[PDB]
Design an enzyme around this catalytic site. Structure first.
Site: not given
Ligand SMILES: OC[C@H]1O[C@H](O)[C@H](O)[C@@H](O)[C@H]1O
Length: 346
Positions: A105, A149, A194
Site C-alpha cells: 500500500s 510504512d 489491528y
Molecule cells: O507495527 C505495526 C504496524 O502495522 C501495520 O504495518 C501498520 O500499517 C503500521 O503503521 C504499524 O502500526
C-alpha cells in the site's frame, strides 16, 4: 515519460508502537513498486500484477473497491491540499509481493505521489510526501495505520535503518552491519484485529492521561483494565527494546540486536496475541539454523517475518526453512534476501 521506483519496507523493531506515538525502527528494502508514466487527460494505469488496466476521469474520485482506489486516494489528497495536477498514463510493475506485509500500500501510494510530484513539478518535501500518503490511506482508502510504512518508504537510506520517534517525527539513520542479511519469509497468509488493538491502545492513553506511550512506565499499568493492561505492557516493553536495539546497532553488536528481536517476537506472540503458528514456526526454525534473531514484521496475523543472518548463509537458511514449511502448511510461502535501501525516487 518518467520511471519511479518505490521500495517496500520491513520494521526491524518497534512493532505496534506507532499508533501510541512510540519508537519505531524500519528500513526501506530493495523490493519495489515500479511506475513508468507520462501526463494524460485522465488516469490510465496498467497493473502487471493484476494483468489489467483500470482508469478514471480526474472528475471521478469515487471509491470503486479495487486497487485503483489507492491511486484515487492520492489524487484526492492532493486536491484536498489545493494542488492542481492532471492525469497520468502508465504502467505499474515491480518485484514487491502484494499483500505480504512488506507495505504494498505505502509503496504504491508513495510511488504514485512521486510520479505526480515529478511530472507536475510539485516539489514536495519528504515529510509532506509521508503525511499525504498516510492521509490518503487513512481517510480515502479507510485503512487505519500509523506512520511507520510511509515514513520508511520515503526516508529510507541505503545501508541504514531509521530510528524514528513517531511523536515528534525526529529521526536518525543508524548503519546496519555489513554481511548481515535480512531474510524475509512470507508465510503465504495475506485488519479487524489491528483496529481493535489500535482502539484499546488509544483508550489506554486517555485513561493514563498521556499523549504517547514513551511517557508510560510499567508501574502505571495497574491503573488500566486487565485487557488494556496486558496489551499496553507489551507496548512499554517494546519502546524500551527499540532504544536497546539503537544502542546495540551503534556498537555493531548484532548478537545483542538478534536477542532483542527474538524476545520481542515472543512478547508479540504471547502477550499482544498477534502472531500465528506459521510465523512462530519460521522464527523457531530460523533460530535453530543459526539466525542471530528473528521476529514477525508489520501487523502480524500472517504476512511476513524476518531473520537476521550471516550473508553467506541467508540462501541456505531460507531454502531449508521453506522446504520444511511447505511440508507442514498449504500456503504459497516465499523467501527473499533484502538489504536496507534508499527511499522512493526516479
Ligand atoms: O507495527 C505495526 C504496524 O502495522 C501495520 O504495518 C501498520 O500499517 C503500521 O503503521 C504499524 O502500526
Amino acid at each position: 515519460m518518467i520511471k519511479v521506483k518505490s521500495p517496500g519496507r520491513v520494521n526491524l523493531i518497534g512493532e505496534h508502537t506507532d499508533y501510541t506515538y512510540g519508537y519505531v525502527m524500519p528500513m526501506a528494502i530493495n523490493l519495489y513498486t515500479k511506475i513508468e508514466a507520462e501526463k494524460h487527460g485522465e488516469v490510465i494505469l496498467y497493473s502487471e500484477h493484476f494483468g489489467e488496466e483500470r482508469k478514471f476521469s480526474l472528475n471521478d474520485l469515487r471509491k470503486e473497491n479495487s486497487w485503483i482506489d489507492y491511486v484515487k486516494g492520492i489524487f484526492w489528497v492532493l486536491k484536498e491540499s489545493d494542488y492542481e495536477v492532471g492525469g497520468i498514463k502508465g504502467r505499474v510493475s515491480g518485484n514487491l509481493p502484494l499483500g505480504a506485509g512488506l507495505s504494498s500500500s505505502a509503496s504504491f501510494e508513495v510511488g504514485i505521489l512521486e510520479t505526480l510530484d515529478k511530472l507536475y513539478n510539485l516539489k514536495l518535501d519528504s515529510l509532506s510526501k509521508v503525511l499525504l500518503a498516510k492521509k490518503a490511506e487513512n481517510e480515502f482508502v479507510g485503512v487505519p495505520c500509523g506512520i511507520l510504512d510511509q515514513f520508511a518508504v520515503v526516508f529510507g537510506r541505503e545501508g541504514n535503518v531509521i530510528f524514528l520517534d513517531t511523536h515528534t517525527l525526529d529521526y536518525e539513520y543508524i548503519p546496519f552491519p555489513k554481511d548481515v542479511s535480512i531474510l524475509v519469509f512470507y508465510t503465504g497468509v495475506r485488519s479487524s484485529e489491528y483496529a481493535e488493538r489500535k482502539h484499546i491502545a488509544e483508550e489506554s492513553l486517555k485513561i493514563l492521561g498521556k499523549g504517547s506511550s514513551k511517557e508510560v512506565r510499567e508501574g502505571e499499568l495497574s491503573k488500566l483494565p486487565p485487557l488494556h493492561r496486558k496489551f499496553f505492557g507489551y507496548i512499554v516493553r517494546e519502546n524500551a527494546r527499540v532504544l536497546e536495539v539503537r544502542d546495540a546497532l551503534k556498537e555493531g553488536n548484532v548478537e545483542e540486536v538478534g536477542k532483542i528481536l527474538t524476545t520481542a517476537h515472543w512478547d508479540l506472540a504471547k502477550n499482544y496475541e498477534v502472531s500465528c503458528k506459521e510465523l512462530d514456526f519460521f522464527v523457531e526454525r530460523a533460530l535453530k539454523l543459526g539466525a542471530y534473531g528473528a521476529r514477525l514484521t508489520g501487523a502480524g496475523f500472517g504476512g511476513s517475518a524476518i531473520a537476521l543472518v550471516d550473508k553467506e548463509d541467508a540462501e541456505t537458511i531460507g531454502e531449508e526453512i521453506l522446504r520444511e514449511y511447505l511440508k507442514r502448511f498449504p500456503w504459497k510461502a516465499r523467501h527473499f534476501i533484502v538489504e536496507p535501501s534508499d527511499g522512493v525516487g526516479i
